[PDB]
């Protein structure tokens, strides 16, 4: 005969790792001047339409900016955002091309050392291109990094205003950062979950769970925002095998702003689900700062 007493306790059996951006690079593609015109054997009529535009790499995101016709001092005016992780020796990589009626003639190249960048925060300056008897770009890039309050947003959103450069998706004044971690009670007792996650236009999906009213994802995901204030994130749970909905919701990014380290985790209601059908998430967001 015994009285037992169990010592139990909360042990990490293991640990998810998602990588996480180390800030966002503001790319102002501006203009170029005195860019390679077309040879000729003899000089003659005409003197060679150049159609300049430029490829911009970061990692793995591509950006394609506006054709200009006939003008070898280029004025693009545009703007793009790219998103930096953790990766030594990695550059901002620009290639520039006459588009043509056949192979685009290369007008010109640039590689940017990024921990260049981010330690000088904020460029506005003439480069000279690579692999070209002549030609310059003229380029202004901003380092923006992560904040874990609101503290600053009104003024980026100003900023965001006064910026009349063109953005083909607009500008963020914040990334929505979280994780779907899963659902519990979901209709029917069995459905194919999937999530579909959105904010605005953008919009990302999880993996398919199958035959399962209680689906695990454990995935994370990445967003750029806009305006934190205005947008929503909706989350859609659908059944892929009959193509229906299983449940939503929908959060005002607005109650993050308050939160603390604008981070809420918790399980959410469903609407239009089950009764006690809900969903587990963490969800933060990081307002998009340039500093000094
Ligand atoms: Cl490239
Ligand atoms: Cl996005």
């Given at each position: 005969n015994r009285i037992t007493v169990p010592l139990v306790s909360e042990v990490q059996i293991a640990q998810l790792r998602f990588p996480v951006p180390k800030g966002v690079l503001r790319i102002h593609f501006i203009e170029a001047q005195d860019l390679q015109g077309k040879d000729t054997y003899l000089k003659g009529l005409v003197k060679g339409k150049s159609d300049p535009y430029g490829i911009i790499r970061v990692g793995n995101q591509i950006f394609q900016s506006r054709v200009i016709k006939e003008n070898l001092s280029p004025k693009?005016?545009?703007?793009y955002e790219?998103?930096?992780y953790e990766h030594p020796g990695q550059e901002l990589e620009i290639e520039l091309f006459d588009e043509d009626p056949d192979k685009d003639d290369f007008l010109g190249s640039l590689m940017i050392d990024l921990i260049e960048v981010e330690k000088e925060r904020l460029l506005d300056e003439w480069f000279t291109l690579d692999e070209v008897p002549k030609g310059k770009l003229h380029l202004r890039l901003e380092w923006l990094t992560l904040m874990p309050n609101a503290s600053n947003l009104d003024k980026v959103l100003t900023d965001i205003k006064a910026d009349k450069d063109q953005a083909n998706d607009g500008l963020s004044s914040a990334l929505l950062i979280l994780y779907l971690d899963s659902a519990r009670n979901?209709?029917?007792?069995?459905?194919?979950?999937?999530?579909?996650?959105?904010?605005?236009?953008?919009?990302?999906?999880?993996?398919?769970?199958?035959?399962?009213?209680?689906?695990?994802?454990?995935?994370?995901?990445?967003?750029?925002?806009h305006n934190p204030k205005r947008q929503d994130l909706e989350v859609e749970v659908?059944?892929?095998?009959?193509?229906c909905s299983l449940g939503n919701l929908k959060v005002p990014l607005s109650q993050l702003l308050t939160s603390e380290d604008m981070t809420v985790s918790q399980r959410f209601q469903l609407s239009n689900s089950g009764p006690n059908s809900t969903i587990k998430m963490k969800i933060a967001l990081r307002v998009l700062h340039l500093e000094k």
């Open positions: 693009w005016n545009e703007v790219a998103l930096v979901l209709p029917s007792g069995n459905p194919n979950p999937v999530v579909q996650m959105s904010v605005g236009h953008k919009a990302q999906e999880s993996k398919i769970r199958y035959k399962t009213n209680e689906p695990v994802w454990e995935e994370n995901f990445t967003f750029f925002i659908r059944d892929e095998q009959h193509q």
